[PDB]
Design an enzyme around this catalytic site. Structure first.
Site, PDB file in Angstrom:
ATOM      1  N   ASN A 253       0.862  -1.173   0.000  1.00 58.24           N
ATOM      2  CA  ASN A 253       0.000   0.000   0.000  1.00 58.24           C
ATOM      3  C   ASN A 253       0.902   1.227   0.000  1.00 58.24           C
ATOM      4  OD1 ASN A 253      -2.522   1.352  -0.055  1.00 58.24           O
ATOM      5  ND2 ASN A 253      -3.379  -0.119   1.416  1.00 58.24           N
ATOM      6  N   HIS A 325      -3.109   1.726  -5.506  1.00 56.72           N
ATOM      7  CA  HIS A 325      -2.314   1.655  -4.278  1.00 56.72           C
ATOM      8  C   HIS A 325      -0.962   1.001  -4.534  1.00 56.72           C
ATOM      9  CE1 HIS A 325      -6.131   2.799  -2.562  1.00 56.72           C
ATOM     10  NE2 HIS A 325      -6.678   1.654  -2.933  1.00 56.72           N
ATOM     11  N   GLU A 394     -10.166  -0.346  -7.628  1.00 56.09           N
ATOM     12  CA  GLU A 394     -10.420   0.841  -8.420  1.00 56.09           C
ATOM     13  C   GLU A 394      -9.423   0.887  -9.568  1.00 56.09           C
ATOM     14  OE1 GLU A 394     -12.401   4.515  -8.697  1.00 56.09           O
ATOM     15  OE2 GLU A 394     -11.681   3.096 -10.207  1.00 56.09           O
TER      16      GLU A 394
END
Ligand SMILES: [Mg+2]
Length: 737
Positions: A253, A325, A394
């Site tokens: 992340n 991410h 996403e």
């Protein structure tokens, strides 16, 4: 005339008492099937009913067909009645609640030693050491099938399944039986919690106990801020303690708020915090590695972590976030950064071009490094991970391009022999490109991104992960589920996902997961620790474990539930706060240095007192004064100041320096989120996270997001004294407060 209104007006026939088959509701112009029960172990798809030793509620639902349409029904609670042959002792209060209990006669008092028969060598060893911890008495393992006080045995047939168990207590001994060795482990947890409340005696009776849901999980963001392995093993044992079994771990992340760097004249692609916690051979052309440079897990460390968690019934699910991410990836391949139009252009650097085939190639290569055989281990790093999480929340580009990538990464895992888990985003990303569903697990984190109803009709196994209910962002203004444990305990059920409600017995409903996201890190990092969020993580568990494993109704109030959490205490052999057993002080007059102390690490509150003299302080050379796996107390840092490094790798400075060649009395006071320094009785300063203080220096104003609290929890290291301390230590004292 009803029209699949029939489903909310159905009439379950009597069910008699102790029947064998679920009687079926009939309506003239309609066809009605059984969808499923919440306790599949009590009413199966075929409708066959299992006996109970205590009256138990079961929720059934149906599919009603009439004309060309259907709709699944509401839940109908039938209650399977047990034959009340007797009554006796009351049911023991356990977290989570025991499903069925037939009270018995008297007590089984334990001897000065306890013997245990167990056909599982590794389970039996585990169980005996948890026993000695709780009881203080010493526990013997006997031959599997020898004469013993407690006998674990594998039962064939029955309804228990891989997580059930029959716990039986008579005054001639205790007999725990299960269908799989994993339910035998849950039986130990039940027995140990009782022995926690009454170590000398357990009431007689029979306990039959099932989980209502298959997946009872906790995700941890171990990427935006580091978590040492020792902490994650405290998490495994504490989950096992409340019979939770799914440890979802975010391996990569990056800092969310890339705008903070842009609006202040800096490059987020070059300065935003990113991490990939697994060791990896991957490196960029510019030599930059994929693996995080401050804290990471070696392949064997992680492979052993997964096997350890399996010993305690927990399945670790590792997650690789792509194409979002992924600043750890784009740093390797800047040429793959998505370049198309988008809604918040300041957060581009973290986005892979999901449309580019040369991107799926990269993501596949990273996955294969843990899904295919590792040369040294002789097996895949993810060999014991049945489920791998592929991310895919996403993509800033075309919706069809997202669907193609989602289908690529889901199918990659399927073809490598792994089940994939994915963030539900198909409602937000609809399209005509087919995305595989059979074999695929999905996290229902938001209703706008995936509707629970359209997820099940597309064919996914679904996990309640709803953001408005189950997200924790530590010390943040939003997503504070830790302040709603009471409401969760009383109202939260796994089949209600946001404002949609599935039937509790829907077979595609796996269970639920609560999530801990570390948003306020990097240039916002307050300096909080994995210690600082332990209370809310463990406290989220003890609530949700009841609502995940147990019935739809809490067996007590939230206030009674919490004083039982206290009677039962921490998990066996699990000291997450590093509390000492006796509050007497530790006194050492060192002979020479380094002195080896070999005492356990001590958490707040405490006070450290030392008489010492710094003989030299060469510039740039670190001087370790106290050392242990939990961290180091730095007498002199590279900048000359006193401070410390924790085992989560965050460094902190007091801003004060020790005098060279002077006798000085050093005191450090450890409190939750505050570690203070006093030199010669005068306040020398309070600790401040130094890790990301740079970069934010020159930001100047408009950095309204600089950390406004300075947290500096410090578990005191007490294994070796003065490892690299160029000086003398005359007197040292440690005192719990
Ligand atoms: Mg062990």
């Amino acid at each position: 005339q009803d029209a699949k209104q029939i489903a909310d007006s159905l009439s379950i026939p009597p069910v008699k008492a102790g029947a064998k088959q679920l009687p079926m509701p009939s309506v003239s112009g309609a066809q009605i099937k059984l969808l499923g029960a919440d306790y599949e172990q009590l009413v199966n798809s075929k409708g066959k009913i299992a006996p109970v030793i205590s009256d138990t509620p079961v929720n059934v639902s149906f599919k009603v067909t009439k004309d060309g349409k259907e709709a699944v029904s509401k839940d109908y609670e039938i209650m399977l009645q047990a034959p009340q042959a007797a009554q006796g002792n009351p049911k023991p209060r356990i977290i989570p609640e025991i499903l069925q209990w037939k009270g018995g006669q008297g007590e089984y008092k334990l001897g000065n030693t306890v013997t245990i028969a167990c056909p599982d060598k590794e389970l039996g060893k585990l169980f005996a050491a948890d026993m000695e911890d709780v009881l203080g008495k010493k526990v013997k393992l006997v031959a599997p099938g020898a004469k013993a006080d407690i006998s674990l045995s594998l039962l064939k047939g029955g309804n228990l399944g891989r997580e059930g168990y029959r716990l039986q207590i008579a005054r001639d001994g205790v007999r725990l039986g299960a269908a799989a060795p994993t339910g035998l482990f849950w039986g130990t947890r039940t027995l140990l919690q009782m022995l926690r409340q009454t170590p000398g005696s357990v009431p007689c009776g029979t306990a039959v106990d099932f989980p209502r849901y298959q997946l009872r999980g906790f995700m941890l963001d171990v990427a935006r801020t580091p978590y040492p392995l020792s902490y994650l093993k405290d998490v495994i044992r504490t989950m096992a303690w409340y019979k939770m079994n799914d440890l979802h771990l975010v391996i990569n992340n990056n800092y969310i708020f890339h705008e903070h760097y842009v609006d202040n004249g800096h490059d987020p692609f070059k300065e935003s915090y990113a991490a990939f916690r697994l060791e990896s051979k991957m490196k960029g052309k510019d030599g930059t590695p994929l693996t995080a440079r401050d804290l990471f897990y070696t392949k064997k460390e992680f492979a052993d972590l997964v096997s350890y968690a399996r010993k305690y019934g927990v399945n670790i699910v590792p997650e690789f976030d792509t194409p979002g991410h992924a600043l750890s990836f784009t740093r390797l391949r800047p040429d793959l950064i998505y370049k198309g139009p988008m809604n918040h252009e300041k957060r581009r650097c973290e986005m892979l071009d999901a449309a580019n085939p040369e991107t799926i190639d990269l993501v596949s290569k990273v996955f294969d490094e843990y899904m295919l055989k590792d040369p040294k281990l002789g097996r895949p790093v993810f060999a014991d991970c049945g489920v791998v999480h592929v991310g895919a929340d996403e993509f800033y580009g075309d919706k069809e391009d997202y669907r193609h990538f989602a289908n690529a990464v889901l199918t990659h895992a399927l073809k490598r022999g792994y089940t994939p888990r994915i963030w539900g985003s198909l409602s937000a990303k609809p399209g005509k490109t087919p995305v595989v569903s059979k074999g695929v697990q999905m996290n229902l984190w938001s209703t706008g991104w995936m509707k629970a109803w359209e997820a099940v009709n597309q064919g996914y196994d679904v996990i309640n992960t709803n953001d408005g209910a189950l997200y924790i962002v530590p010390f943040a203004g939003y997503y504070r589920m830790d302040r709603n444990h009471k409401g969760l305990y009383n109202n939260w059920i796994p089949n209600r996902i946001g404002n949609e409600t599935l039937p509790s017995g829907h077979p595609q409903l796996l269970g639920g997961t609560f999530a801990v996201w570390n948003d306020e890190t990097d240039i916002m990092h307050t300096g909080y620790a994995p210690y600082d969020i332990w209370g809310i993580i463990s406290g989220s568990m003890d609530v949700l474990s009841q609502k995940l494993w147990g019935t739809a109704k809490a067996p007590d109030t939230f206030e009674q539930h919490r004083e039982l959490v206290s009677s039962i205490g921490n998990a066996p052999r699990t000291n997450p706060l590093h509390k000492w057993k006796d509050s007497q002080p530790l006194t050492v007059k060192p002979s020479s240095l380094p002195q080896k102390l070999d005492k356990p690490a001590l958490g707040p509150n405490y006070r450290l007192t030392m008489e010492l003299e710094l003989t030299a302080a060469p510039e740039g050379k670190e001087q370790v004064l106290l050392a242990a796996p939990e961290g180091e107390l730095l007498a002199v840092m590279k900048d000359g100041t006193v401070g410390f490094r924790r085992d989560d790798s965050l460094e902190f400075s007091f801003g004060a320096k020790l005098p060279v060649g002077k006798k000085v009395k050093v005191e450090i006071v450890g409190e939750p989120e505050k570690t203070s320094l006093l030199l010669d009785g005068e306040p020398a300063g309070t600790a401040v996270l130094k890790n990301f203080s740079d970069k934010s220096k020159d930001f100047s104003d408009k950095f309204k997001h600089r950390p406004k609290v300075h947290r500096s929890t410090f578990i005191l290291p007490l294994k070796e004294l003065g490892s690299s301390f160029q000086g003398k230590v005359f007197h040292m004292n440690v005192q719990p407060l």
